[PDB]
Amino acid sequence: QELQQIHQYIMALREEYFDPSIVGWTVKYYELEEKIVSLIKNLLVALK
Known part of the structure; x- marks a missing residue:
């Protein structure tokens, strides 16, 4: 969530x-x- 902030x-x-x-x-x-940011977000999900 703080990535977006x-x-x-x-x-x-x-x-x-x-x-x-x-x-x-x-x-x-x-x-x-933001695309790369989304990519980072994606990795987070995978990590979960």
């Missing part, structure tokens, strides 16, 4: 202090990271 905090840190040029190159990229 860490992901959300790291995600909010991108816009709470920085103003990058475009959003699409970022957010989609961000979603890619």
Whole structure:
């Protein structure tokens, strides 16, 4: 459960202090990271 909270905090840190040029190159990229996060989540389930 805390994996998602860490992901959300790291995600909010991108816009709470920085103003990058475009959003699409970022957010989609961000979603890619979530994929790996999901993968980690998956492993957790397997571990259980």
